[PDB]
């Protein structure tokens, strides 16, 4: 039975929860407040990915159609296309970026089940979300860290699902901006500035980059050839960081928070298949399986079976 979706409100009212300039110290009451405010967005993402995962298992046409029912409801309500309410930061825009990515990823996986009506309304919505999220970054002040790279997930998934060569080129630029930002020692300076979370955010920056390159495979393109060796350096630094945080400790100036690779760390499920040295990523692979609705759902199964299930 396909549950009723949350309201697809045009407006988003998120609240930033970091207190320091490095955006590494969390106010627990602001975080709890945000989680309540963005509950319909996280619930939307979690369900459409749940439904896409179940469709991908086979013999569950119904789950794929339930994902589409949710997507079509939010598309027809103009969800997230209204006001991005500013409380103390741009958290509302960050949510639109992540939720667009989850929505476009789910559509990419389930569109074979979509009626023409659903295709028209969802794709129009996803293209409007792509234009809105991209326009946010037209402001110079907004620094293009991992939030920028995650914006490429929704743009890329929309591009592949709609066969929009223009959005494809926009997504490639976002991917390449990330690859271009990798320094010769493997670091991403804006993620290295997050102190105790430097490892966490190098991990979180690698995830959309890898996902974009993997979606490019769906159209026969090998984006891993761009600046050959840069992504490998970044990805290896992350894998090494979970083994031993000494290098991140030294370059960030802070002792990294102890954490097991989880969720969006599942970019490793794909990258271990692309790396010339897969054994570097066995430790991270062993922490699987990995699931993240913002990346389409079960990364462990998608790496084995493909992002888009066979119709």
Number of strands: 2
**Binned strand content:** under 5%
Shape descriptor reads: globular
**Which strand order does the major sheet show?**
1-2
SSE string, helices as H and strands as E: HHHHHHHHHHHHHEEH
Total number of distinct structural domains: 1
Number of helical runs?
A: 14
PDB class: lyase
Keywords: PL-5 polysaccharide lyase in apo form at pH8.5, lyase, Pandoraea apista
Assembly: monomeric
Entry title: Crystal Structure of PL-5 family polysaccharide lyase PanPL from Pandoraea apista at pH8.5 in apo form
Give a summary of the structure in a few sentences.
With 311 residues, the chain is an all-alpha fold. The protein is 59% helix and 1% strand.
How would you describe what is shown here?
- With 311 residues, the chain is mainly alpha-helical.
- It has one domain (28-305).
- The chain contains 14 helices and 2 strands; from the N terminus they run αααααααααααααββα.
- The chain has a two-stranded antiparallel sheet with strand order 1-2.
- β1 and β2 form a beta hairpin.
- The longest helix has 21 residues, at 116-136.
- The two termini are 22 Å apart.
SSE inventory with pairings:
Elements: H1 28-37, H2 39-57, H3 61-76, H4 91-110, H5 116-136, H6 146-162, H7 165-181, H8 189-192, H9 198-217, H10 230-243, H11 246-252, H12 267-274, H13 282-286, E1 291-292, E2 297-298, H14 299-305
Antiparallel strand pairs: 1-2
